[PDB]
Amino acid sequence: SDKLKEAETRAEFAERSVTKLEKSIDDLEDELYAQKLKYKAISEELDHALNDMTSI
Amino acid sequence: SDKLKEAETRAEFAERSVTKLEKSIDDLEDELYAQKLKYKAISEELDHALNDMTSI
Amino acid sequence: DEDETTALVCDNGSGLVKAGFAGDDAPRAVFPSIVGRPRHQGVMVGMGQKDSYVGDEAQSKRGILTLKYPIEHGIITNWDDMEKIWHHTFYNELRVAPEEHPTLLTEAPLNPKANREKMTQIMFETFNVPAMYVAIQAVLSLYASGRTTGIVLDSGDGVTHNVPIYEGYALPHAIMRLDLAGRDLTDYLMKILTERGYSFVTTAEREIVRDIKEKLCYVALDFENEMATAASSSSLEKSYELPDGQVITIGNERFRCPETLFQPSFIGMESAGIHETTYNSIMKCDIDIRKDLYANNVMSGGTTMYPGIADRMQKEITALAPSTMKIKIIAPPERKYSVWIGGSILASLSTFQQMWITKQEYDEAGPSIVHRKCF
Amino acid sequence: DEDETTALVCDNGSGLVKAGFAGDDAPRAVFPSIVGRPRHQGVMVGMGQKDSYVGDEAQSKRGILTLKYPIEHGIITNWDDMEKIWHHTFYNELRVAPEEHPTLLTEAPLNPKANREKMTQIMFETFNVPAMYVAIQAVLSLYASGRTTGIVLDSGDGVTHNVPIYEGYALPHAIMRLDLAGRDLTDYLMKILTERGYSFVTTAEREIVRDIKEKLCYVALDFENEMATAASSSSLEKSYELPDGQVITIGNERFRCPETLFQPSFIGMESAGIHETTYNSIMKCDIDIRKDLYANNVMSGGTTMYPGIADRMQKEITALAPSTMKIKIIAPPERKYSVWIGGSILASLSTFQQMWITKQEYDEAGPSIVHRKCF
Amino acid sequence: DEDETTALVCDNGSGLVKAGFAGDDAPRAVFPSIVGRPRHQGVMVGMGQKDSYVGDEAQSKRGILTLKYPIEHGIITNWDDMEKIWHHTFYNELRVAPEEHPTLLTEAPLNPKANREKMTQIMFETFNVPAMYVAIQAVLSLYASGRTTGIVLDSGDGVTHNVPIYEGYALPHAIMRLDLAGRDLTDYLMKILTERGYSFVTTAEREIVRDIKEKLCYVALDFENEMATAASSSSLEKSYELPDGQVITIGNERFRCPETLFQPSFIGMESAGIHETTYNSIMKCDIDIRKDLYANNVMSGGTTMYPGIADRMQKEITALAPSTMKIKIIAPPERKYSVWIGGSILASLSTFQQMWITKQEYDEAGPSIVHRKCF
Ligand SMILES: Nc1ncnc2c1ncn2[C@@H]1O[C@H](COP(=O)(O)OP(=O)(O)O)[C@@H](O)[C@H]1O
Ligand SMILES: Nc1ncnc2c1ncn2[C@@H]1O[C@H](COP(=O)(O)OP(=O)(O)O)[C@@H](O)[C@H]1O
Ligand SMILES: Nc1ncnc2c1ncn2[C@@H]1O[C@H](COP(=O)(O)OP(=O)(O)O)[C@@H](O)[C@H]1O
Ligand SMILES: [Mg+2]
Ligand SMILES: [Mg+2]
Ligand SMILES: [Mg+2]
């Protein structure tokens, strides 16, 4: 019974670590996707300005 | 004893999940880093363009 | 029984039955859908001598009973079997009478309409439930996720369904059912174990090998390279302790069993892997929202307790679809109860009793009323 | 082979390939556009062990082959597949060498110009045809009808095209392509039969259910009233004898399958029924001739063998358009060969060899010459 | 809402609705004139389930809605649609009540008088606007330019109008409407992209291809020479990144799409290019001022954001007209808001409230009063 309790404690520790890392990954994931949405926007717009060079 | 093997099973499950999540976090943070740096470089260049506009 | 007349919430999932009361967080009576019958006739006396055995009783009495499945891939064998198991669940397991509590049930996706009409009619005649509602498990898993956008992969024990739902609206035109499920997994593992020297046919070993799938199985990151390195693989090879005490060692098979769903050509299906079925499903609908479907895919079912589905899923979809937007899967722990949770969610709000299927409506229009009352 | 150097006439219709000699009344070699490939690998010896299977050979060997479509809705998968099937048609089926006979081909309406340039280039390099001409199937069906005024509804197996032509002139500004065709019909019928209890995915059952569509299907005169009376409908309900011997009974589905083209909202298309597509097409052009278009509508394709398109067509157009002038449809029996007949008609007259696309023109200007030689 | 009772300024342009307060420089609520409706029926609950969707909401929900146009080329389908969109604009977008602010509206040139009478009557009954004024968008664009002499080319999304006005005087005898507009542009581009291998029918791809027209399209300086050099044109060929992530490459089509307005014979119009329509318009009026019309031409509309209209315009007019006097076009940036700006200009001066169309005048003479109160 004592060994079962120690193993259960360690398993619960690991599982809480799992959940916390998953939440951190979520936050990072959202930030990276937004970063990239705006990166592609600014890149396209620099290209549009270059198109302006073509129109000139 | 059956409960103890089940505890060891869930512990190993959670530990493998932890390792996967840690590696994912590291790679995601490196990718986000490089992405933000490239966006910062383009933003730099665009700021220089704004400064030139002001000089006009 | 609670003093209040709260509703019954019962998920008759294809592989597991999970029943309880509305307002509860988890179903109270959860049992597999196996049903045991006496393998021989009666000559002894003093105990036993009972026909139907259901639930943990049959689990303990697996060896003495012919183990039969009243439902397989949605098809219904004998309504009497459901009658008995529902009696057992309501009275011996839930300790509840269906007279005073309306029932919310969940059904397998795209279940026969004739099946619905017959099951509802036998139900209403046999039982005295005051009111009724039945819903597809897809929207239930959606409710458990609590996000109106996404494609649900329901991996039951008889069928795997891919259903896209955008902003809480069903897309039947892009919904498909695949005949690969737990049964296939057990079969394929059975033949591989036969090639490993152990050849069993009976259902007890079926449950043993599905337990092995629950415990030890991998989802290979790269298939042929992992068997190539699994040639010897003393560390990678993994063993199990069967209840009789023998140590059974399995290596590449751990990740060669779930792979069959991904690679159906192993045992001869024209349909490609389930990732192709999610891919085609996505493109059938308008182009624009497809990216959101990529980013909002959900997976549900008891099988989902296995590792490896998430990484394989994302990598293959990114291989098939352009890698601009980031694809991420969401799957809450213990999601096999999630459907039942959604049932409780349905009973949570006060609008749900506006469309209870009451006794008098069925008495007026027969079973046909459900054709107009649910959809 | 005929002693004379008469031309080859080949209709590569989207769903059927019909090939023969010029001056003939009907194509000699007619086969569906399915292509079968070995489902597994080679270990046996003594017979078979051949990759490509085309024509009736693949029809007999449907079960053992993965059945794939080298063309779907005009899109080209693998030119090698066309290479092999044309080899088979010319030598094993037509018993003709393309060296000594120029080829007249028909292409699906609004086919890609890049598709034309690549197919012509691979053709000219691989084959040794002396001369070439390719035409749209719309004017071919017009020629089969032999009336320069009318709107052609070409219902192939991948696309349905509506094309107006007044006094023998094309109106591309009022031409449209709809992604509803045989494929959709089979799909929709597949899901309804799934709701009837029979769920198949493979192509053999696809051909079985399209055969069912050929034999038993109705076009409902009034839709919801006919399902209302088809509730029981012992007489109206119709059965089929599947080759395995089981009797499969279908009722309202007979007229609920083709209705989907008329009512696309069943499986989610923004475009309305094909009658709306003919209507809009008509009004896009000048008002005055519209009446003639109403009175001169033609329908063409293999699907046209089904009953019910004519009555539905006229009634709905009369509902949409004023009912002063009388609208009448014309459709000669066995019109799926009609396009090929028109090809023979093209070779009938002595002016046709003024604009054969010879080898030396292609050698001079590359494929680009067709851009100036056909249109 | 401002403390002052200043008037509402609303431009219901054929393609865009731009609304705001008088005295403001730019309209506050600007949205396209598309309207989305639920593609299917209601079975779900908990969210959504709303009929009309307008503005950015419908833009986000484009895939789930049938996208319909309440106005096309001036023709009105359903006044209820305008009722709902005006409700949305006034309360959900402008956060203003029309009770306390008179409305200045702009209408498409040569709009039906019956249309004006019905729209004004439904407006006055449904709404409680204190006072009214409606004006042609031509004089509004003139006001934005602030020069009483010139010919206005109003290129909306349904019609293109050429209207000459000399010294702030309308010339209806020399005003014409051409049925070429954004719709035609999208259609023609749709058929060319179909010939490029990509065939779509739904409205989401319509918006995608009009976005492509906004971004990449050219106006060819010389047409056939530019396709001749665009044969290969690796540098001249331009690509777009569609939101799904696929790279779609287009070459000559960039300048072959707007060319159709200049060359209507591509898809069959008797009327020649819009430059011919400005030319005829000019000569219809007295000879002498024609030179001023040549030198004072103005162009207005959202399309004007594209490059190439100015150079093409001047060169062709100089080709048609004698090249003694210098022709120059004027077009301020962001001129699609210019009409609304002119509306604010109308409210700027204190004489404008002398001819507000008050409630009591309409109550006395019905809608007919506008026949005497505006013109
Ligand atoms: N704790 C668990 N771990 C792993 N697999 C499980 C577990 N419980 C059940 N399963 C698997 O789930 C399957 C039953 O699926 P089920 O959840 O009934 O599908 P559905 O979601 O359609 O009801 C069984 O065949 C079993 O192999
Ligand atoms: N004898 C028949 N009766 C009914 N339908 C048929 C028959 N033969 C072919 N079809 C249908 O016609 C379709 C093929 O159309 P097809 O004639 O190839 O179009 P196209 O005229 O564009 O070549 C097939 O999908 C099949 O279902
Ligand atoms: N920023 C933009 N760049 C290029 N084209 C645009 C832009 N905004 C709108 N348009 C085009 O303008 C059209 C709408 O014209 P609109 O300005 O409503 O005409 P009107 O001036 O008669 O109101 C749309 O079809 C769209 O293609
Ligand atoms: Mg499941
Ligand atoms: Mg056809
Ligand atoms: Mg305009």
Tab-separated table of C-alpha atoms in Angstrom, chain C residues 12-339:
chain	number	residue	atom	x	y	z
C	12	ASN	CA	-25.425	4.108	-25.669
C	13	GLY	CA	-22.080	4.445	-27.385
C	14	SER	CA	-21.038	1.796	-29.892
C	15	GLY	CA	-18.900	-0.145	-27.441
C	16	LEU	CA	-19.840	1.300	-24.050
C	17	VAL	CA	-23.064	2.230	-22.249
C	18	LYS	CA	-22.754	5.135	-19.796
C	19	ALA	CA	-25.883	6.106	-17.862
C	20	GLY	CA	-26.710	8.463	-15.030
C	21	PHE	CA	-28.726	11.458	-13.893
C	22	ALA	CA	-28.902	14.947	-15.352
C	23	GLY	CA	-26.856	17.554	-13.520
C	24	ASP	CA	-24.162	14.981	-12.723
C	25	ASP	CA	-20.596	15.408	-13.943
C	26	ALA	CA	-19.914	11.761	-14.855
C	27	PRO	CA	-22.176	8.812	-15.709
C	28	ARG	CA	-22.825	6.544	-12.745
C	29	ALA	CA	-23.247	3.146	-14.447
C	30	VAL	CA	-20.660	2.509	-17.174
C	31	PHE	CA	-20.302	-0.932	-18.727
C	32	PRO	CA	-19.061	-2.466	-21.987
C	33	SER	CA	-21.637	-3.593	-24.537
C	34	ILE	CA	-20.802	-7.324	-24.362
C	35	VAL	CA	-23.602	-9.753	-23.444
C	36	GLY	CA	-23.022	-13.281	-22.133
C	37	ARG	CA	-25.291	-16.292	-22.507
C	38	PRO	CA	-25.072	-19.789	-20.959
C	39	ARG	CA	-22.795	-21.890	-23.160
C	40	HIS	CA	-24.634	-25.089	-22.141
C	41	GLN	CA	-27.955	-26.308	-20.742
C	42	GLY	CA	-29.303	-26.698	-17.213
C	43	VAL	CA	-29.023	-29.852	-15.094
C	44	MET	CA	-27.590	-28.415	-11.856
C	45	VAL	CA	-29.605	-26.568	-9.207
C	46	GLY	CA	-29.064	-24.401	-6.118
C	47	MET	CA	-27.592	-21.299	-7.786
C	48	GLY	CA	-27.157	-19.462	-11.060
C	49	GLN	CA	-29.192	-20.899	-13.951
C	50	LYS	CA	-29.948	-17.437	-15.327
C	51	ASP	CA	-30.040	-16.664	-19.049
C	52	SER	CA	-28.917	-13.079	-19.656
C	53	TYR	CA	-25.699	-11.916	-17.993
C	54	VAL	CA	-24.695	-8.272	-18.459
C	55	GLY	CA	-22.108	-5.878	-17.085
C	56	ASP	CA	-19.382	-6.835	-14.647
C	57	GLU	CA	-21.260	-10.061	-13.913
C	58	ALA	CA	-20.616	-11.208	-17.475
C	59	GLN	CA	-17.068	-9.850	-17.262
C	60	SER	CA	-16.457	-12.176	-14.318
C	61	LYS	CA	-18.353	-14.987	-16.074
C	62	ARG	CA	-16.726	-14.540	-19.490
C	63	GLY	CA	-15.365	-18.077	-19.643
C	64	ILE	CA	-18.682	-19.828	-19.068
C	65	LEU	CA	-20.754	-17.677	-21.436
C	66	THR	CA	-20.930	-17.336	-25.172
C	67	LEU	CA	-20.092	-13.649	-25.525
C	68	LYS	CA	-22.288	-11.950	-28.122
C	69	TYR	CA	-22.662	-8.357	-29.290
C	70	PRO	CA	-26.257	-7.048	-29.474
C	71	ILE	CA	-24.933	-4.214	-31.672
C	72	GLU	CA	-22.087	-4.223	-34.186
C	73	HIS	CA	-21.327	-1.194	-36.346
C	74	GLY	CA	-24.796	0.078	-35.534
C	75	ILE	CA	-26.696	-2.981	-36.744
C	76	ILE	CA	-29.212	-4.301	-34.203
C	77	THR	CA	-29.507	-8.052	-33.586
C	78	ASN	CA	-32.178	-8.553	-30.907
C	79	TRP	CA	-34.203	-5.814	-29.216
C	80	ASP	CA	-34.847	-8.161	-26.280
C	81	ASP	CA	-31.140	-7.868	-25.441
C	82	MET	CA	-31.413	-4.077	-25.216
C	83	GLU	CA	-34.609	-4.498	-23.185
C	84	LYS	CA	-32.804	-6.639	-20.611
C	85	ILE	CA	-29.649	-4.522	-20.458
C	86	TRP	CA	-31.687	-1.324	-20.038
C	87	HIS	CA	-33.709	-3.011	-17.282
C	88	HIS	CA	-30.431	-3.944	-15.580
C	89	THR	CA	-28.988	-0.447	-15.996
C	90	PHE	CA	-32.088	1.367	-14.739
C	91	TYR	CA	-32.926	-0.853	-11.764
C	92	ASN	CA	-29.890	-2.933	-10.749
C	93	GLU	CA	-27.222	-0.337	-11.632
C	94	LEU	CA	-28.848	3.117	-11.618
C	95	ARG	CA	-31.516	2.169	-9.039
C	96	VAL	CA	-33.930	4.455	-10.895
C	97	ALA	CA	-37.410	4.079	-12.352
C	98	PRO	CA	-37.865	5.604	-15.837
C	99	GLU	CA	-41.485	6.545	-15.050
C	100	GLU	CA	-40.559	9.862	-13.402
C	101	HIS	CA	-37.524	10.913	-15.475
C	102	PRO	CA	-37.351	11.833	-19.174
C	103	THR	CA	-34.437	10.287	-21.054
C	104	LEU	CA	-31.809	11.960	-23.221
C	105	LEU	CA	-30.068	9.380	-25.409
C	106	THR	CA	-27.161	9.570	-27.839
C	107	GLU	CA	-27.043	7.473	-31.004
C	108	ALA	CA	-24.278	6.482	-33.386
C	109	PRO	CA	-23.864	8.874	-36.340
C	110	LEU	CA	-26.063	8.167	-39.372
C	111	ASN	CA	-27.977	5.411	-37.605
C	112	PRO	CA	-30.856	3.902	-39.612
C	113	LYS	CA	-34.118	5.826	-39.556
C	114	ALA	CA	-35.993	2.517	-39.476
C	115	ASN	CA	-33.777	1.552	-36.537
C	116	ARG	CA	-34.789	4.765	-34.786
C	117	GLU	CA	-38.503	4.198	-35.474
C	118	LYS	CA	-38.460	0.576	-34.210
C	119	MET	CA	-36.287	1.277	-31.160
C	120	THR	CA	-38.450	4.257	-30.178
C	121	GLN	CA	-41.654	2.253	-30.604
C	122	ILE	CA	-40.488	-0.757	-28.573
C	123	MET	CA	-39.097	1.669	-25.986
C	124	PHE	CA	-42.351	3.609	-25.595
C	125	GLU	CA	-44.463	0.445	-25.412
C	126	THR	CA	-42.164	-1.515	-23.080
C	127	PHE	CA	-41.100	1.391	-20.850
C	128	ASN	CA	-43.013	4.288	-19.298
C	129	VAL	CA	-40.546	7.135	-19.822
C	130	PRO	CA	-42.421	10.473	-19.653
C	131	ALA	CA	-40.430	12.230	-22.368
C	132	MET	CA	-37.681	11.599	-24.888
C	133	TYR	CA	-34.848	13.151	-26.823
C	134	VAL	CA	-32.169	11.462	-28.926
C	135	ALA	CA	-29.168	13.201	-30.469
C	136	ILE	CA	-26.101	12.397	-32.557
C	137	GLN	CA	-22.912	11.846	-30.556
C	138	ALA	CA	-21.069	14.287	-32.841
C	139	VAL	CA	-22.757	17.410	-31.485
C	140	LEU	CA	-22.403	15.933	-27.982
C	141	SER	CA	-18.620	15.728	-28.374
C	142	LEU	CA	-18.766	19.244	-29.825
C	143	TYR	CA	-20.591	20.397	-26.689
C	144	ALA	CA	-17.961	18.706	-24.537
C	145	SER	CA	-15.315	20.677	-26.424
C	146	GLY	CA	-17.544	23.758	-26.233
C	147	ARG	CA	-16.470	25.160	-29.609
C	148	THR	CA	-18.934	25.421	-32.496
C	149	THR	CA	-16.243	25.002	-35.196
C	150	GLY	CA	-14.367	21.792	-35.926
C	151	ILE	CA	-14.405	18.343	-37.482
C	152	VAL	CA	-15.244	15.498	-35.091
C	153	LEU	CA	-13.517	12.127	-35.456
C	154	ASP	CA	-15.745	9.731	-33.489
C	155	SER	CA	-13.813	6.459	-33.076
C	156	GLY	CA	-16.282	3.995	-31.590
C	157	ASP	CA	-15.914	0.236	-31.346
C	158	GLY	CA	-17.887	-0.491	-34.521
C	159	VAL	CA	-17.479	2.543	-36.795
C	160	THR	CA	-15.237	5.588	-37.145
C	161	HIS	CA	-17.125	8.690	-38.271
C	162	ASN	CA	-15.755	11.952	-39.631
C	163	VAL	CA	-18.249	14.802	-39.341
C	164	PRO	CA	-17.515	18.491	-40.056
C	165	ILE	CA	-19.466	21.149	-38.174
C	166	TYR	CA	-18.816	24.849	-38.772
C	167	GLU	CA	-20.168	27.422	-36.303
C	168	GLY	CA	-22.456	24.814	-34.772
C	169	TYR	CA	-24.038	23.577	-38.009
C	170	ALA	CA	-23.930	19.980	-39.227
C	171	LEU	CA	-22.498	19.187	-42.681
C	172	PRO	CA	-24.014	15.818	-43.669
C	173	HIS	CA	-22.753	16.257	-47.243
C	174	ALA	CA	-19.191	15.946	-45.893
C	175	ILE	CA	-19.841	13.213	-43.306
C	176	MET	CA	-18.475	9.694	-43.757
C	177	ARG	CA	-18.458	6.382	-41.900
C	178	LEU	CA	-15.522	3.953	-42.035
C	179	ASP	CA	-15.903	0.293	-41.071
C	180	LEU	CA	-12.566	0.295	-39.201
C	181	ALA	CA	-12.849	0.256	-35.418
C	182	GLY	CA	-11.832	-1.714	-32.348
C	183	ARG	CA	-13.090	-4.956	-33.885
C	184	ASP	CA	-10.663	-4.604	-36.795
C	185	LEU	CA	-7.827	-3.693	-34.421
C	186	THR	CA	-8.393	-6.854	-32.372
C	187	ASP	CA	-8.697	-8.981	-35.529
C	188	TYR	CA	-5.461	-7.697	-37.089
C	189	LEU	CA	-3.648	-8.082	-33.760
C	190	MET	CA	-5.064	-11.605	-33.519
C	191	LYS	CA	-3.573	-12.602	-36.861
C	192	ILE	CA	-0.207	-11.014	-36.037
C	193	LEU	CA	-0.121	-12.798	-32.668
C	194	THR	CA	-1.005	-15.976	-34.569
C	195	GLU	CA	2.113	-15.323	-36.641
C	196	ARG	CA	3.917	-14.829	-33.316
C	197	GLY	CA	2.952	-18.343	-32.165
C	198	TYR	CA	-0.176	-17.637	-30.083
C	199	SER	CA	-3.466	-18.495	-31.811
C	200	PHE	CA	-6.720	-17.894	-29.919
C	201	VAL	CA	-10.274	-17.432	-31.186
C	202	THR	CA	-12.432	-16.900	-28.095
C	203	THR	CA	-13.554	-13.536	-26.717
C	204	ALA	CA	-11.623	-13.697	-23.432
C	205	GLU	CA	-8.410	-13.427	-25.373
C	206	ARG	CA	-10.108	-10.674	-27.423
C	207	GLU	CA	-10.465	-8.629	-24.249
C	208	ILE	CA	-6.915	-9.534	-23.203
C	209	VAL	CA	-5.501	-8.280	-26.503
C	210	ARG	CA	-7.587	-5.094	-26.437
C	211	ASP	CA	-6.191	-4.530	-22.932
C	212	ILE	CA	-2.735	-5.010	-24.460
C	213	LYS	CA	-3.696	-2.362	-27.023
C	214	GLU	CA	-4.752	-0.074	-24.180
C	215	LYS	CA	-1.463	-0.534	-22.332
C	216	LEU	CA	1.509	-1.118	-24.630
C	217	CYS	CA	0.601	-0.118	-28.190
C	218	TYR	CA	2.527	2.578	-30.060
C	219	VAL	CA	1.656	4.734	-33.043
C	220	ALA	CA	4.774	4.574	-35.212
C	221	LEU	CA	6.277	7.912	-36.202
C	222	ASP	CA	7.919	6.290	-39.250
C	223	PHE	CA	6.718	2.796	-40.040
C	224	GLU	CA	9.239	0.780	-42.039
C	225	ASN	CA	12.193	2.492	-40.361
C	226	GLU	CA	10.784	1.531	-36.967
C	227	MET	CA	10.416	-2.129	-37.904
C	228	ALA	CA	13.946	-1.925	-39.347
C	229	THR	CA	15.248	-0.700	-35.989
C	230	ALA	CA	12.806	-3.045	-34.196
C	231	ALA	CA	14.531	-6.067	-35.740
C	232	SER	CA	16.372	-6.628	-32.441
C	233	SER	CA	15.315	-3.693	-30.244
C	234	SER	CA	15.866	-5.234	-26.868
C	235	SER	CA	14.953	-1.965	-25.132
C	236	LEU	CA	12.216	-0.940	-27.582
C	237	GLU	CA	10.564	-4.377	-27.438
C	238	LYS	CA	7.957	-4.450	-24.669
C	239	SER	CA	6.417	-7.251	-22.637
C	240	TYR	CA	3.108	-7.900	-20.897
C	241	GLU	CA	2.190	-10.051	-17.901
C	242	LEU	CA	-0.929	-12.013	-18.808
C	243	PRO	CA	-3.243	-12.831	-15.876
C	244	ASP	CA	-2.297	-16.523	-16.047
C	245	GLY	CA	1.278	-15.346	-15.373
C	246	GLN	CA	3.036	-15.985	-18.687
C	247	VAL	CA	5.189	-13.168	-20.050
C	248	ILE	CA	4.239	-12.353	-23.651
C	249	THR	CA	6.709	-10.153	-25.524
C	250	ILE	CA	5.717	-7.927	-28.465
C	251	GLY	CA	7.917	-5.576	-30.461
C	252	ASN	CA	7.013	-3.833	-33.709
C	253	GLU	CA	3.431	-5.122	-33.430
C	254	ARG	CA	2.802	-2.410	-30.821
C	255	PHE	CA	2.934	0.202	-33.578
C	256	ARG	CA	1.989	-2.140	-36.424
C	257	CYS	CA	-1.573	-2.608	-35.096
C	258	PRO	CA	-3.033	0.928	-35.036
C	259	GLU	CA	-1.158	1.609	-38.279
C	260	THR	CA	-3.707	-0.530	-40.123
C	261	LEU	CA	-6.311	2.225	-39.741
C	262	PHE	CA	-3.766	4.600	-41.320
C	263	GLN	CA	-2.687	1.978	-43.905
C	264	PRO	CA	-5.843	-0.056	-44.751
C	265	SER	CA	-4.077	-1.878	-47.607
C	266	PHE	CA	-2.594	-4.228	-44.992
C	267	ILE	CA	-5.888	-6.132	-44.821
C	268	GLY	CA	-7.527	-4.912	-48.001
C	269	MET	CA	-9.680	-1.781	-47.913
C	270	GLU	CA	-10.160	0.440	-50.950
C	271	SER	CA	-10.512	3.438	-48.633
C	272	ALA	CA	-7.189	4.960	-47.613
C	273	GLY	CA	-6.210	5.975	-44.089
C	274	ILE	CA	-8.575	7.919	-41.868
C	275	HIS	CA	-6.459	11.039	-42.434
C	276	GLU	CA	-7.421	10.839	-46.115
C	277	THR	CA	-11.052	10.562	-45.007
C	278	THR	CA	-10.684	13.754	-42.953
C	279	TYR	CA	-8.879	15.437	-45.878
C	280	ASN	CA	-11.543	14.615	-48.504
C	281	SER	CA	-14.234	15.580	-45.984
C	282	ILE	CA	-12.588	18.977	-45.600
C	283	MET	CA	-12.274	19.751	-49.320
C	284	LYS	CA	-15.858	18.684	-50.133
C	285	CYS	CA	-17.048	21.879	-48.398
C	286	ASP	CA	-16.192	25.442	-49.449
C	287	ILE	CA	-12.484	26.225	-49.688
C	288	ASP	CA	-12.313	29.204	-47.335
C	289	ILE	CA	-13.286	27.657	-43.987
C	290	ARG	CA	-11.072	24.642	-44.647
C	291	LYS	CA	-8.180	26.304	-42.812
C	292	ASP	CA	-10.357	26.627	-39.704
C	293	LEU	CA	-11.261	22.955	-40.033
C	294	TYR	CA	-7.533	22.216	-40.140
C	295	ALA	CA	-7.001	24.240	-36.969
C	296	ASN	CA	-10.122	23.056	-35.114
C	297	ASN	CA	-10.098	19.279	-35.572
C	298	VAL	CA	-11.356	17.314	-32.571
C	299	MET	CA	-11.050	13.604	-31.852
C	300	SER	CA	-13.383	11.649	-29.555
C	301	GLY	CA	-13.840	8.067	-28.382
C	302	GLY	CA	-12.470	5.531	-25.930
C	303	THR	CA	-9.657	4.616	-28.318
C	304	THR	CA	-8.328	8.166	-27.969
C	305	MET	CA	-6.773	7.095	-24.661
C	306	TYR	CA	-3.954	5.649	-26.772
C	307	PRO	CA	-0.848	7.741	-27.502
C	308	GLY	CA	0.304	8.716	-30.965
C	309	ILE	CA	-2.922	9.755	-32.698
C	310	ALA	CA	-2.238	13.491	-32.235
C	311	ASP	CA	1.305	13.640	-33.652
C	312	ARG	CA	0.463	11.347	-36.569
C	313	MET	CA	-2.703	13.327	-37.275
C	314	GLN	CA	-1.040	16.724	-37.465
C	315	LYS	CA	2.051	15.581	-39.368
C	316	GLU	CA	0.081	13.804	-42.114
C	317	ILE	CA	-2.457	16.629	-42.503
C	318	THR	CA	0.410	19.126	-42.781
C	319	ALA	CA	1.981	16.845	-45.392
C	320	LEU	CA	-1.285	16.765	-47.368
C	321	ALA	CA	-2.383	20.400	-46.785
C	322	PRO	CA	-0.214	23.528	-47.152
C	323	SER	CA	1.869	24.261	-44.058
C	324	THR	CA	1.172	27.990	-43.738
C	325	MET	CA	-1.377	27.948	-40.912
C	326	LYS	CA	-0.598	25.977	-37.769
C	327	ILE	CA	-2.688	22.845	-37.169
C	328	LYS	CA	-3.343	21.811	-33.563
C	329	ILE	CA	-5.562	19.056	-32.148
C	330	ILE	CA	-7.551	19.389	-28.912
C	331	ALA	CA	-8.526	16.381	-26.791
C	332	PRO	CA	-9.503	16.676	-23.100
C	333	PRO	CA	-8.496	13.785	-20.828
C	334	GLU	CA	-11.169	11.129	-20.255
C	335	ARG	CA	-13.162	12.240	-23.292
C	336	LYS	CA	-15.060	8.946	-23.609
C	337	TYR	CA	-17.327	10.293	-20.851
C	338	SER	CA	-17.478	13.664	-22.621
C	339	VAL	CA	-20.567	12.770	-24.675
